Protein backbone atom coordinates (compact mmCIF):
# COMPACT_ATOMS: atom_id res chain seq x y z
CA UNK A 1 0.00 0.00 0.00
CA UNK A 2 0.94 3.68 0.29
CA UNK A 3 0.93 4.95 3.89
CA UNK A 4 2.36 8.17 5.29
CA UNK A 5 4.81 8.01 8.17
CA UNK A 6 4.87 10.86 10.67
CA UNK A 7 8.13 11.19 12.55
CA UNK A 8 7.76 12.43 16.13
CA UNK A 9 10.68 14.04 17.98
CA UNK A 10 9.71 17.08 20.12
CA UNK A 11 5.99 17.00 19.38
CA UNK A 12 4.74 14.12 21.47
CA UNK A 13 1.00 14.68 21.10
CA UNK A 14 -1.76 14.01 18.60
CA UNK A 15 -3.49 17.40 18.91
CA UNK A 16 -2.56 20.78 17.40
CA UNK A 17 0.36 19.32 15.42
CA UNK A 18 1.16 21.10 12.13
CA UNK A 19 3.00 18.25 10.41
CA UNK A 20 0.68 15.52 11.63
CA UNK A 21 -2.38 17.51 10.54
CA UNK A 22 -0.88 18.18 7.12
CA UNK A 23 -0.16 14.47 6.75
CA UNK A 24 -3.70 13.49 7.76
CA UNK A 25 -5.12 15.69 5.00
CA UNK A 26 -3.12 13.57 2.57
CA UNK A 27 -3.90 10.12 3.97
CA UNK A 28 -5.86 8.32 6.70
CA UNK A 29 -3.25 5.56 6.64
CA UNK A 30 -1.21 7.72 8.99
CA UNK A 31 1.35 5.83 11.07
CA UNK A 32 3.34 7.56 13.78
CA UNK A 33 6.90 6.70 14.75
CA UNK A 34 9.62 7.59 17.22
CA UNK A 35 13.29 6.70 16.90
CA UNK A 36 15.47 6.31 19.99
CA UNK A 37 18.64 7.87 18.62
CA UNK A 38 21.78 6.62 20.45
CA UNK A 39 23.72 9.82 19.74
CA UNK A 40 21.14 11.64 21.86
CA UNK A 41 20.24 8.97 24.40
CA UNK A 42 23.82 7.95 25.22
CA UNK A 43 24.96 11.56 25.48
CA UNK A 44 26.70 12.62 28.68
CA UNK A 45 24.42 15.68 28.42
CA UNK A 46 21.17 13.72 28.68
CA UNK A 47 19.19 14.35 31.87
CA UNK A 48 17.60 11.34 33.64
CA UNK A 49 14.52 13.46 34.43
CA UNK A 50 14.18 14.37 30.77
CA UNK A 51 14.27 10.71 29.71
CA UNK A 52 11.59 9.92 32.32
CA UNK A 53 9.33 12.73 31.15
CA UNK A 54 9.93 11.71 27.52
CA UNK A 55 9.14 8.05 28.18
CA UNK A 56 5.96 9.11 29.94
CA UNK A 57 4.95 11.18 26.91
CA UNK A 58 5.61 8.27 24.54
CA UNK A 59 3.46 5.95 26.64
CA UNK A 60 0.45 8.20 26.18
CA UNK A 61 1.26 8.78 22.51
CA UNK A 62 1.09 5.01 21.90
CA UNK A 63 -2.44 5.02 23.31
CA UNK A 64 -3.49 8.08 21.32
CA UNK A 65 -2.44 6.43 18.06
CA UNK A 66 -4.12 3.17 19.04
CA UNK A 67 -7.34 5.04 19.82
CA UNK A 68 -7.08 7.02 16.58
CA UNK A 69 -7.00 3.86 14.49
CA UNK A 70 -3.34 3.06 13.87
CA UNK A 71 -0.17 2.91 15.96
CA UNK A 72 3.14 4.44 17.02
CA UNK A 73 6.15 2.57 15.64
CA UNK A 74 9.23 2.43 17.86
CA UNK A 75 12.86 2.15 16.71
CA UNK A 76 16.34 2.33 18.20
CA UNK A 77 19.31 3.34 16.07
CA UNK A 78 20.69 5.87 13.59
CA UNK A 79 17.84 7.90 12.00
CA UNK A 80 19.26 8.46 8.52
CA UNK A 81 19.65 4.71 8.14
CA UNK A 82 16.60 3.34 9.96
CA UNK A 83 13.96 5.87 8.92
CA UNK A 84 14.59 5.53 5.15
CA UNK A 85 14.79 1.75 5.45
CA UNK A 86 11.46 1.72 7.25
CA UNK A 87 9.85 4.06 4.74
CA UNK A 88 11.16 1.94 1.87
CA UNK A 89 9.97 -1.33 3.43
CA UNK A 90 6.57 0.33 3.82
CA UNK A 91 6.67 1.85 0.32
CA UNK A 92 5.68 5.07 2.08
CA UNK A 93 4.01 7.75 -0.01
CA UNK A 94 5.95 10.15 2.24
CA UNK A 95 7.50 10.86 5.61
CA UNK A 96 6.43 14.01 7.47
CA UNK A 97 7.92 15.76 10.49
CA UNK A 98 8.27 19.13 12.18
CA UNK A 99 11.44 21.18 11.71
CA UNK A 100 14.13 21.52 14.35
CA UNK A 101 16.05 24.70 15.22
CA UNK A 102 19.09 22.90 16.68
CA UNK A 103 22.35 22.14 14.76
CA UNK A 104 22.16 18.38 15.35
CA UNK A 105 18.51 18.00 14.38
CA UNK A 106 18.80 20.12 11.28
CA UNK A 107 21.91 18.30 10.05
CA UNK A 108 20.29 14.94 10.72
CA UNK A 109 17.10 16.04 8.99
CA UNK A 110 18.94 17.12 5.88
CA UNK A 111 20.49 13.65 5.76
CA UNK A 112 17.21 11.81 6.26
CA UNK A 113 15.47 13.87 3.58
CA UNK A 114 18.32 13.32 1.10
CA UNK A 115 18.24 9.61 1.91
CA UNK A 116 14.49 9.57 1.32
CA UNK A 117 14.75 11.48 -1.96
CA UNK A 118 17.28 8.95 -3.24
CA UNK A 119 14.75 6.25 -2.41
CA UNK A 120 12.23 8.32 -4.33
CA UNK A 121 10.17 8.98 -1.22
CA UNK A 122 8.74 12.43 -0.46
CA UNK A 123 9.86 14.17 2.73
CA UNK A 124 7.77 17.05 4.11
CA UNK A 125 9.21 19.22 6.88
CA UNK A 126 6.88 21.81 8.42
CA UNK A 127 7.11 24.33 11.27
CA UNK A 128 5.20 23.49 14.42
CA UNK A 129 6.90 24.42 17.71
CA UNK A 130 7.00 28.17 17.00
CA UNK A 131 4.09 30.53 16.50
CA UNK A 132 6.30 32.13 13.86
CA UNK A 133 9.16 30.40 12.03
CA UNK A 134 12.67 31.95 11.99
CA UNK A 135 12.17 32.82 8.30
CA UNK A 136 9.00 34.77 9.03
CA UNK A 137 10.60 37.22 11.45
CA UNK A 138 13.21 39.45 9.82
CA UNK A 139 14.09 43.14 9.85
CA UNK A 140 13.36 45.69 7.15
CA UNK A 141 16.70 44.60 5.72
CA UNK A 142 15.62 40.97 5.80
CA UNK A 143 18.00 40.06 8.62
CA UNK A 144 17.53 38.21 11.93
CA UNK A 145 17.38 40.05 15.28
CA UNK A 146 20.12 39.97 17.92
CA UNK A 147 18.33 42.47 20.20
CA UNK A 148 15.06 41.58 21.91
CA UNK A 149 13.16 44.88 21.77
CA UNK A 150 12.92 45.07 17.93
CA UNK A 151 12.28 41.33 17.65
CA UNK A 152 9.33 41.65 20.01
CA UNK A 153 7.94 44.65 18.10
CA UNK A 154 7.88 42.60 14.89
CA UNK A 155 6.76 39.30 16.46
CA UNK A 156 3.95 41.00 18.40
CA UNK A 157 2.38 42.54 15.28
CA UNK A 158 2.32 39.27 13.32
CA UNK A 159 -1.05 37.54 12.92
CA UNK A 160 -1.15 34.60 15.34
CA UNK A 161 -1.95 31.09 14.03
CA UNK A 162 -4.67 28.95 15.62
CA UNK A 163 -4.69 25.26 16.66
CA UNK A 164 -5.03 22.67 13.90
CA UNK A 165 -7.22 19.54 13.99
CA UNK A 166 -6.51 16.28 15.81
CA UNK A 167 -6.29 13.46 13.23
CA UNK A 168 -9.01 10.81 13.51
CA UNK A 169 -10.19 7.61 11.85
CA UNK A 170 -6.71 6.44 10.93
CA UNK A 171 -6.02 3.24 9.01
CA UNK A 172 -3.63 0.81 10.71
CA UNK A 173 -0.91 -1.27 9.04
CA UNK A 174 -1.68 -4.81 7.84
CA UNK A 175 0.08 -8.06 8.86
CA UNK A 176 1.97 -8.13 5.57
CA UNK A 177 3.14 -4.57 6.16
CA UNK A 178 4.04 -5.39 9.74
CA UNK A 179 6.04 -8.38 8.51
CA UNK A 180 8.00 -6.23 6.09
CA UNK A 181 9.23 -3.96 8.88
CA UNK A 182 9.49 -6.39 11.82
CA UNK A 183 13.35 -6.35 11.89
CA UNK A 184 13.41 -2.56 12.35
CA UNK A 185 10.97 -2.38 15.26
CA UNK A 186 11.24 -2.61 19.03
CA UNK A 187 8.54 -4.99 20.30
CA UNK A 188 7.54 -2.51 23.00
CA UNK A 189 8.39 0.84 24.58
CA UNK A 190 11.44 0.28 26.79
CA UNK A 191 11.02 1.27 30.44
CA UNK A 192 13.21 3.97 31.97
CA UNK A 193 15.14 1.26 33.83
CA UNK A 194 15.63 -0.81 30.65
CA UNK A 195 17.18 2.29 29.06
CA UNK A 196 19.55 2.42 32.01
CA UNK A 197 18.05 5.42 33.79
CA UNK A 198 16.46 6.06 37.16
CA UNK A 199 14.36 9.03 38.25
CA UNK A 200 12.13 9.42 41.27
CA UNK A 201 12.15 13.19 41.71
CA UNK A 202 8.80 13.99 40.12
CA UNK A 203 7.93 16.61 37.50
CA UNK A 204 6.63 20.23 37.28
CA UNK A 205 3.69 18.70 35.39
CA UNK A 206 2.97 14.99 34.97
CA UNK A 207 4.12 13.54 31.61
CA UNK A 208 1.75 13.40 28.67
CA UNK A 209 -0.48 15.38 26.35
CA UNK A 210 -3.51 15.08 28.65
CA UNK A 211 -1.72 16.36 31.75
CA UNK A 212 -0.13 19.17 29.74
CA UNK A 213 -3.51 20.31 28.42
CA UNK A 214 -4.99 20.14 31.92
CA UNK A 215 -2.21 22.30 33.33
CA UNK A 216 -2.54 24.88 30.58
CA UNK A 217 -6.27 25.14 31.22
CA UNK A 218 -5.87 25.32 35.02
CA UNK A 219 -3.14 27.94 34.82
CA UNK A 220 -5.00 30.14 32.34
CA UNK A 221 -8.14 29.83 34.42
CA UNK A 222 -6.65 31.36 37.54
CA UNK A 223 -2.93 31.57 38.36
CA UNK A 224 -2.12 33.47 35.16
CA UNK A 225 -4.04 36.55 36.39
CA UNK A 226 -1.37 37.09 39.02
CA UNK A 227 1.59 36.06 36.85
CA UNK A 228 2.94 39.57 37.35
CA UNK A 229 4.31 39.99 39.95
CA UNK A 230 3.97 36.40 41.24
CA UNK A 231 6.44 35.22 38.57
CA UNK A 232 9.31 36.91 40.41
CA UNK A 233 9.09 34.80 43.59
CA UNK A 234 10.56 31.25 43.75
CA UNK A 235 8.63 30.61 46.97
CA UNK A 236 5.33 31.23 45.19
CA UNK A 237 4.09 28.67 42.67
CA UNK A 238 3.38 31.51 40.26
CA UNK A 239 4.54 30.01 36.96
CA UNK A 240 2.84 27.47 34.69
CA UNK A 241 5.37 24.66 35.04
CA UNK A 242 4.74 23.80 31.39
CA UNK A 243 8.39 24.02 30.32
CA UNK A 244 8.93 20.28 29.77
CA UNK A 245 5.56 20.07 28.01
CA UNK A 246 6.70 22.80 25.62
CA UNK A 247 10.17 21.29 25.16
CA UNK A 248 8.72 17.89 24.23
CA UNK A 249 5.55 19.20 22.63
CA UNK A 250 3.16 17.55 25.08
CA UNK A 251 1.22 20.74 24.37
CA UNK A 252 0.99 22.71 21.11
CA UNK A 253 2.30 26.27 20.99
CA UNK A 254 -0.92 27.47 19.34
CA UNK A 255 -3.08 25.94 22.09
CA UNK A 256 -0.92 27.69 24.67
CA UNK A 257 -1.23 31.04 22.90
CA UNK A 258 -4.96 30.66 22.33
CA UNK A 259 -5.60 29.71 25.98
CA UNK A 260 -3.72 32.76 27.25
CA UNK A 261 -5.43 34.96 24.66
CA UNK A 262 -8.90 33.71 25.65
CA UNK A 263 -8.07 34.36 29.29
CA UNK A 264 -7.10 37.92 28.35
CA UNK A 265 -10.35 38.44 26.46
CA UNK A 266 -12.36 36.99 29.35
CA UNK A 267 -10.62 39.09 31.99
CA UNK A 268 -12.20 42.44 32.84
CA UNK A 269 -9.40 43.55 35.16
CA UNK A 270 -6.47 45.68 34.03
CA UNK A 271 -3.97 43.96 36.34
CA UNK A 272 -5.01 40.51 35.13
CA UNK A 273 -4.80 41.66 31.50
CA UNK A 274 -1.27 42.86 32.14
CA UNK A 275 -0.39 39.62 33.94
CA UNK A 276 -1.52 37.64 30.92
CA UNK A 277 0.28 39.89 28.43
CA UNK A 278 3.42 39.36 30.47
CA UNK A 279 3.05 35.59 30.28
CA UNK A 280 2.59 35.88 26.51
CA UNK A 281 5.81 37.88 26.49
CA UNK A 282 7.58 34.82 27.93
CA UNK A 283 6.49 32.83 24.88
CA UNK A 284 8.01 35.61 22.76
CA UNK A 285 11.34 35.38 24.60
CA UNK A 286 11.18 31.65 23.88
CA UNK A 287 10.96 32.29 20.13
CA UNK A 288 13.66 34.99 20.35
CA UNK A 289 16.22 32.46 21.58
CA UNK A 290 15.00 29.62 19.35
CA UNK A 291 15.14 31.92 16.34
CA UNK A 292 18.60 33.06 17.42
CA UNK A 293 19.92 29.51 17.64
CA UNK A 294 18.47 28.90 14.21
CA UNK A 295 19.96 32.04 12.64
CA UNK A 296 23.25 31.90 14.58
CA UNK A 297 24.04 28.19 15.12
CA UNK A 298 27.56 29.00 16.37
CA UNK A 299 25.91 30.36 19.53
CA UNK A 300 25.79 26.75 20.72
CA UNK A 301 29.59 26.63 20.70
CA UNK A 302 29.95 28.91 23.72
CA UNK A 303 30.62 32.65 24.35
CA UNK A 304 29.43 34.35 21.17
CA UNK A 305 30.67 37.94 21.26
CA UNK A 306 34.38 38.27 20.37
CA UNK A 307 35.51 39.75 23.69
CA UNK A 308 34.03 36.81 25.55
CA UNK A 309 35.64 34.21 23.33
CA UNK A 310 38.83 35.50 25.01
CA UNK A 311 37.73 35.78 28.65
CA UNK A 312 40.40 34.46 31.05
CA UNK A 313 38.22 31.93 32.89
CA UNK A 314 39.82 30.84 36.17
CA UNK A 315 38.13 27.42 36.14
CA UNK A 316 38.80 26.14 39.66
CA UNK A 317 37.23 22.68 39.42
CA UNK A 318 36.69 22.61 43.19
CA UNK A 319 34.43 25.67 43.08
CA UNK A 320 32.39 24.13 40.26
CA UNK A 321 32.02 20.85 42.13
CA UNK A 322 30.84 22.73 45.20
CA UNK A 323 28.33 24.56 42.98
CA UNK A 324 26.97 21.34 41.43
CA UNK A 325 26.61 19.86 44.94
CA UNK A 326 24.81 22.84 46.48
CA UNK A 327 27.73 23.38 48.87
CA UNK A 328 28.59 26.98 47.93
CA UNK A 329 27.67 28.37 51.34
CA UNK A 330 25.22 30.81 49.77
CA UNK A 331 21.71 29.77 50.92
CA UNK A 332 19.82 31.21 47.97
CA UNK A 333 22.24 29.51 45.59
CA UNK A 334 22.33 26.15 47.38
CA UNK A 335 18.55 25.97 47.79
CA UNK A 336 18.23 26.45 44.04
CA UNK A 337 20.83 23.85 43.07
CA UNK A 338 19.17 21.36 45.42
CA UNK A 339 15.75 21.89 43.86
CA UNK A 340 17.39 21.31 40.48
CA UNK A 341 19.17 18.07 41.31
CA UNK A 342 16.24 16.76 43.35
CA UNK A 343 13.31 17.74 41.14
CA UNK A 344 14.89 18.42 37.76
CA UNK A 345 13.41 21.91 37.64
CA UNK A 346 14.33 25.38 38.90
CA UNK A 347 12.42 28.67 39.16
CA UNK A 348 13.71 31.07 36.51
CA UNK A 349 14.69 33.74 39.04
CA UNK A 350 16.83 31.06 40.68
CA UNK A 351 18.40 29.95 37.39
CA UNK A 352 19.37 33.59 36.81
CA UNK A 353 20.94 33.72 40.27
CA UNK A 354 22.89 30.45 40.24
CA UNK A 355 24.07 31.17 36.68
CA UNK A 356 25.20 34.67 37.61
CA UNK A 357 26.92 33.15 40.66
CA UNK A 358 28.71 30.44 38.70
CA UNK A 359 29.89 32.82 35.97
CA UNK A 360 30.51 36.05 37.91
CA UNK A 361 31.44 34.75 41.38
CA UNK A 362 33.11 31.41 40.70
CA UNK A 363 34.45 32.70 37.39
CA UNK A 364 33.98 29.41 35.60
CA UNK A 365 33.54 29.10 31.82
CA UNK A 366 29.72 29.12 31.82
CA UNK A 367 29.71 26.18 29.44
CA UNK A 368 30.28 23.95 32.48
CA UNK A 369 27.06 25.31 33.94
CA UNK A 370 25.15 25.03 30.68
CA UNK A 371 26.24 21.40 30.54
CA UNK A 372 25.32 20.72 34.17
CA UNK A 373 21.86 22.22 33.60
CA UNK A 374 21.37 20.04 30.53
CA UNK A 375 22.42 17.04 32.60
CA UNK A 376 19.63 17.75 35.11
CA UNK A 377 16.81 19.83 33.57
CA UNK A 378 13.57 18.06 32.70
CA UNK A 379 13.07 20.97 30.30
CA UNK A 380 16.72 21.06 29.19
CA UNK A 381 16.59 23.00 25.95
CA UNK A 382 19.59 24.17 23.93
CA UNK A 383 18.09 27.46 22.69
CA UNK A 384 16.74 28.45 26.10
CA UNK A 385 19.57 27.00 28.18
CA UNK A 386 22.29 28.51 25.98
CA UNK A 387 20.37 31.76 25.93
CA UNK A 388 20.25 31.71 29.71
CA UNK A 389 23.98 31.09 30.09
CA UNK A 390 25.05 33.53 27.38
CA UNK A 391 22.87 35.89 29.41
CA UNK A 392 24.91 35.35 32.59
CA UNK A 393 27.73 37.21 30.84
CA UNK A 394 25.99 39.17 28.09
CA UNK A 395 28.22 37.15 25.78
CA UNK A 396 25.48 36.39 23.26
CA UNK A 397 22.16 37.88 22.12
CA UNK A 398 20.62 41.02 23.63
CA UNK A 399 23.83 42.10 25.44
CA UNK A 400 23.65 44.48 28.39
CA UNK A 401 26.33 46.45 30.30
CA UNK A 402 28.62 44.48 32.60
CA UNK A 403 26.76 43.55 35.77
CA UNK A 404 27.18 41.13 38.67
CA UNK A 405 24.28 39.88 40.79
CA UNK A 406 24.78 40.18 44.55
CA UNK A 407 23.35 36.92 45.99
CA UNK A 408 22.22 38.71 49.15
CA UNK A 409 20.38 41.49 47.29
CA UNK A 410 18.58 39.00 45.04
CA UNK A 411 17.66 36.78 47.99
CA UNK A 412 16.31 39.72 50.00
CA UNK A 413 14.54 41.06 46.94
CA UNK A 414 12.92 37.84 45.69
CA UNK A 415 12.78 35.66 48.83
CA UNK A 416 12.48 38.32 51.55
CA UNK A 417 11.16 35.85 54.14
CA UNK A 418 13.66 33.15 53.13
CA UNK A 419 10.68 30.81 52.68
CA UNK A 420 12.21 29.29 49.55
CA UNK A 421 15.63 28.94 51.20
CA UNK A 422 14.20 27.11 54.21
CA UNK A 423 12.13 24.89 51.92
CA UNK A 424 15.10 23.42 50.06
CA UNK A 425 17.58 23.79 52.92
CA UNK A 426 15.60 22.27 55.84
CA UNK A 427 18.76 21.73 57.91
CA UNK A 428 18.77 25.54 58.15
CA UNK A 429 15.12 26.01 59.15
CA UNK A 430 16.28 27.07 62.62
CA UNK A 431 18.32 29.96 61.23
CA UNK A 432 16.81 33.45 60.93
CA UNK A 433 15.78 34.62 57.42
CA UNK A 434 17.90 37.70 58.06
CA UNK A 435 21.09 35.64 58.10
CA UNK A 436 20.02 33.20 55.36
CA UNK A 437 19.65 36.22 53.09
CA UNK A 438 22.94 37.85 54.04
CA UNK A 439 24.59 34.46 53.86
CA UNK A 440 26.44 35.26 57.07
CA UNK A 441 25.72 32.36 59.41
CA UNK A 442 27.47 31.77 62.72
CA UNK A 443 29.42 28.47 62.71
CA UNK A 444 27.55 26.83 65.60
CA UNK A 445 24.17 27.78 64.13
CA UNK A 446 25.53 26.71 60.74
CA UNK A 447 25.82 23.13 61.97
CA UNK A 448 27.06 21.10 59.02
CA UNK A 449 26.13 23.65 56.35
CA UNK A 450 29.35 24.83 54.67
CA UNK A 451 30.64 28.39 54.90
CA UNK A 452 30.72 30.60 51.77
CA UNK A 453 33.27 29.15 49.33
CA UNK A 454 34.18 32.63 48.07
CA UNK A 455 34.05 36.21 49.32
CA UNK A 456 31.58 37.90 46.96
CA UNK A 457 33.27 41.28 47.17
CA UNK A 458 36.67 39.84 46.28
CA UNK A 459 35.23 37.74 43.42
CA UNK A 460 33.36 40.78 42.10
CA UNK A 461 36.56 42.81 41.95
CA UNK A 462 38.50 39.95 40.38
CA UNK A 463 35.95 39.51 37.58
CA UNK A 464 35.74 43.25 36.87
CA UNK A 465 39.54 43.40 36.88
CA UNK A 466 39.89 40.62 34.30
CA UNK A 467 37.08 42.13 32.22
CA UNK A 468 38.68 45.58 32.14
CA UNK A 469 42.20 44.30 31.57
CA UNK A 470 40.94 42.33 28.57
CA UNK A 471 38.70 45.17 27.41
CA UNK A 472 41.79 47.41 27.40
CA UNK A 473 44.12 44.78 25.95
CA UNK A 474 41.74 44.73 22.98
C1 LIG B 1 20.68 29.94 33.07
C2 LIG B 1 19.25 29.57 32.63
C3 LIG B 1 19.02 28.40 31.91
C4 LIG B 1 17.74 28.13 31.42
N1 LIG B 1 17.47 26.84 30.97
C5 LIG B 1 16.28 26.62 30.25
C6 LIG B 1 16.14 25.28 29.70
O1 LIG B 1 17.04 24.47 29.47
N2 LIG B 1 14.86 25.02 29.20
C7 LIG B 1 13.74 25.88 29.23
O2 LIG B 1 12.77 25.69 28.55
N3 LIG B 1 14.02 27.14 29.74
C8 LIG B 1 15.21 27.58 30.30
N4 LIG B 1 15.37 28.81 30.98
C9 LIG B 1 14.33 29.74 30.91
C10 LIG B 1 13.37 29.54 32.11
O3 LIG B 1 14.04 29.61 33.36
C11 LIG B 1 12.19 28.55 32.00
O4 LIG B 1 11.58 28.39 30.73
C12 LIG B 1 11.26 28.43 33.22
O5 LIG B 1 11.93 28.19 34.46
C13 LIG B 1 10.14 27.44 32.99
O6 LIG B 1 9.17 27.43 34.05
P1 LIG B 1 7.66 27.62 33.62
O7 LIG B 1 7.30 26.64 32.54
O8 LIG B 1 6.84 27.59 34.84
O9 LIG B 1 7.74 29.10 32.98
P2 LIG B 1 6.58 30.23 32.74
O10 LIG B 1 6.99 31.43 33.43
O11 LIG B 1 5.23 29.69 32.99
O12 LIG B 1 6.79 30.55 31.18
C14 LIG B 1 6.06 29.82 30.16
C15 LIG B 1 6.99 29.30 29.05
O13 LIG B 1 7.77 30.36 28.47
C16 LIG B 1 9.10 29.86 28.16
N5 LIG B 1 10.11 30.68 28.87
C17 LIG B 1 10.00 31.37 30.06
N6 LIG B 1 11.09 31.99 30.40
C18 LIG B 1 11.80 32.06 29.23
C19 LIG B 1 13.09 32.56 28.93
N7 LIG B 1 13.76 33.29 29.82
N8 LIG B 1 13.79 32.00 27.86
C20 LIG B 1 13.21 31.07 27.07
N9 LIG B 1 11.95 30.59 27.19
C21 LIG B 1 11.32 31.09 28.34
C22 LIG B 1 9.16 28.39 28.60
O14 LIG B 1 8.91 27.55 27.49
C23 LIG B 1 8.02 28.31 29.62
O15 LIG B 1 7.51 26.99 29.87
C24 LIG B 1 16.70 29.13 31.46
C25 LIG B 1 16.96 30.36 32.14
C26 LIG B 1 18.20 30.58 32.74
C27 LIG B 1 18.49 31.94 33.38
Amino acid sequence: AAPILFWHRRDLRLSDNIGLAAARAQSAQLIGLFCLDPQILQSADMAPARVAYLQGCLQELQQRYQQAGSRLLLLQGDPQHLIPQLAQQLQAEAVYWNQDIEPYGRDRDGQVAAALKTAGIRAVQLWDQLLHSPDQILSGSGNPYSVYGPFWKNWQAQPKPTPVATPTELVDLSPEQLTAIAPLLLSELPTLKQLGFDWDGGFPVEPGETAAIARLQEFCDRAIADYDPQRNFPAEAGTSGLSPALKFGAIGIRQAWQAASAAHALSRSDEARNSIRVWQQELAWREFYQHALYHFPSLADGPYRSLWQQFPWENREALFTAWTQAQTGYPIVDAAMRQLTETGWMHNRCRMIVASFLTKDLIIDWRRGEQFFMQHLVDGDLAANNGGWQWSASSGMDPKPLRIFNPASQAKKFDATATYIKRWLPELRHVHPKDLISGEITPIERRGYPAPIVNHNLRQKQFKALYNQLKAAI
Side-chain angles (χ1 to χ4, degrees), residues 1-3 5-17 19-30 32-39 41-82 84-100 102-120 122-136 138-180 182-212 214-223 225-250 252 254-275 277-331 333-352 354-362 365-403 405-420 422-436 438-440 442-443 445-452 454-473:
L5 286 169
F6 181 80
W7 182 15
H8 283 92
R9 298 93 74 80
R10 319 283 215 197
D11 55 346
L12 315 175
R13 66 180 183 288
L14 219 60
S15 69
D16 185 35
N17 187 312
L20 193 56
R24 179 66 181 84
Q26 296 304 315
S27 173
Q29 191 174 167
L30 188 49
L33 73 127
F34 184 90
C35 184
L36 289 168
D37 182 352
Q39 286 191 66
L41 282 166
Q42 296 283 175
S43 174
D45 287 353
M46 174 57 79
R50 207 156 62 242
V51 188
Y53 184 85
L54 165 70
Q55 201 276 341
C57 290
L58 293 177
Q59 286 194 281
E60 196 178 317
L61 189 53
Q62 300 186 74
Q63 291 188 289
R64 286 281 269 161
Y65 263 99
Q66 198 282 158
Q67 306 172 316
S70 72
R71 67 184 67 204
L72 171 63
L73 303 181
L74 304 163
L75 295 72
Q76 186 154 195
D78 181 58
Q80 69 179 297
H81 277 80
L82 301 189
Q85 279 174 30
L86 178 75
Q88 195 169 67
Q89 275 309 90
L90 241 30
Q91 185 177 249
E93 166 187 343
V95 186
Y96 278 63
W97 74 73
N98 297 315
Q99 286 187 53
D100 199 326
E102 301 170 4
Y104 180 74
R106 297 200 59 74
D107 291 346
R108 163 204 60 196
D109 289 353
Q111 293 299 84
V112 175
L116 294 171
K117 187 173 184 58
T118 290
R122 302 175 181 178
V124 182
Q125 306 176 253
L126 310 175
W127 286 108
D128 173 85
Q129 71 179 231
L130 291 160
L131 291 171
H132 303 292
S133 66
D135 295 321
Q136 210 201 327
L138 301 174
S139 63
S141 307
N143 296 314
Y145 294 95
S146 65
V147 187
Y148 182 73
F151 172 97
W152 162 249
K153 177 179 183 183
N154 181 323
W155 197 92
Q156 189 286 313
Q158 301 284 4
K160 293 289 171 291
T162 54
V164 291
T166 298
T168 63
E169 304 196 293
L170 309 186
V171 180
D172 197 7
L173 289 174
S174 69
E176 290 192 12
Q177 289 176 302
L178 296 173
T179 299
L184 300 152
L185 310 178
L186 283 181
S187 56
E188 59 175 3
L189 181 61
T191 57
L192 187 64
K193 66 203 286 62
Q194 188 61 56
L195 294 176
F197 292 93
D198 70 284
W199 177 247
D200 186 47
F203 307 99
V205 59
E206 295 310 302
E209 183 181 350
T210 297
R215 171 60 63 70
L216 174 65
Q217 287 165 172
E218 288 167 39
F219 180 73
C220 287
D221 268 47
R222 284 298 181 291
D226 303 309
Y227 190 56
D228 193 40
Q230 288 322 94
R231 68 198 182 86
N232 302 303
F233 314 111
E236 296 305 315
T239 63
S240 75
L242 286 165
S243 50
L246 285 164
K247 188 271 156 56
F248 283 111
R254 285 149 305 273
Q255 304 170 306
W257 178 267
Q258 181 176 67
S261 182
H264 183 280
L266 180 65
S267 175
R268 73 292 74 177
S269 162
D270 281 355
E271 279 203 56
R273 311 265 285 184
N274 174 74
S275 283
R277 297 270 92 153
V278 177
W279 194 71
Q280 294 181 299
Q281 188 79 178
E282 302 309 308
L283 305 182
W285 272 97
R286 170 170 180 277
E287 317 231 332
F288 175 66
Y289 294 126
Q290 291 201 194
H291 281 214
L293 183 54
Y294 179 92
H295 293 303
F296 308 117
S298 67
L299 273 164
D301 301 318
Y304 189 71
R305 294 167 62 67
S306 53
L307 181 290
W308 290 99
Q309 297 170 55
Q310 314 173 67
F311 196 77
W313 302 108
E314 187 176 63
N315 296 317
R316 284 173 52 178
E317 195 60 31
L319 296 183
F320 176 67
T321 300
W323 182 80
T324 68
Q325 307 185 317
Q327 291 288 300
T328 68
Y330 286 69
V333 179
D334 292 333
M337 294 303 292
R338 277 264 275 283
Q339 171 178 47
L340 170 55
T341 63
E342 289 182 51
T343 66
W345 189 83
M346 185 188 300
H347 185 90
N348 181 248
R349 168 53 62 180
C350 289
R351 307 194 193 193
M352 288 174 78
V354 303
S356 176
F357 187 84
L358 182 66
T359 298
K360 304 293 172 42
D361 282 74
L362 310 193
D365 182 310
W366 61 245
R367 278 173 287 203
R368 296 298 299 285
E370 163 184 46
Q371 173 174 50
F372 189 73
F373 260 33
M374 280 303 305
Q375 301 180 315
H376 293 277
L377 290 171
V378 69
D379 57 26
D381 175 73
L382 182 54
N385 191 54
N386 182 269
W389 287 96
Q390 294 264 20
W391 165 92
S392 78
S394 283
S395 61
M397 300 289 103
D398 207 48
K400 303 294 187 176
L402 181 72
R403 181 192 171 189
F405 275 27
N406 178 307
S409 309
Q410 293 282 318
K412 177 179 181 298
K413 200 186 308 173
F414 305 106
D415 190 45
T417 47
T419 301
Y420 174 89
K422 288 182 178 177
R423 180 177 301 161
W424 297 100
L425 296 177
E427 71 274 52
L428 272 51
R429 200 272 286 183
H430 64 292
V431 183
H432 283 60
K434 174 72 166 49
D435 302 307
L436 292 177
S438 64
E440 309 179 8
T442 61
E445 198 170 357
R446 198 180 65 209
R447 283 73 188 301
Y449 186 67
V454 291
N455 175 283
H456 178 64
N457 198 48
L458 290 173
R459 303 309 291 188
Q460 178 157 189
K461 297 185 180 183
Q462 188 182 347
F463 193 100
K464 293 182 175 178
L466 295 174
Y467 185 71
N468 289 311
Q469 291 180 178
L470 181 58
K471 189 176 169 63

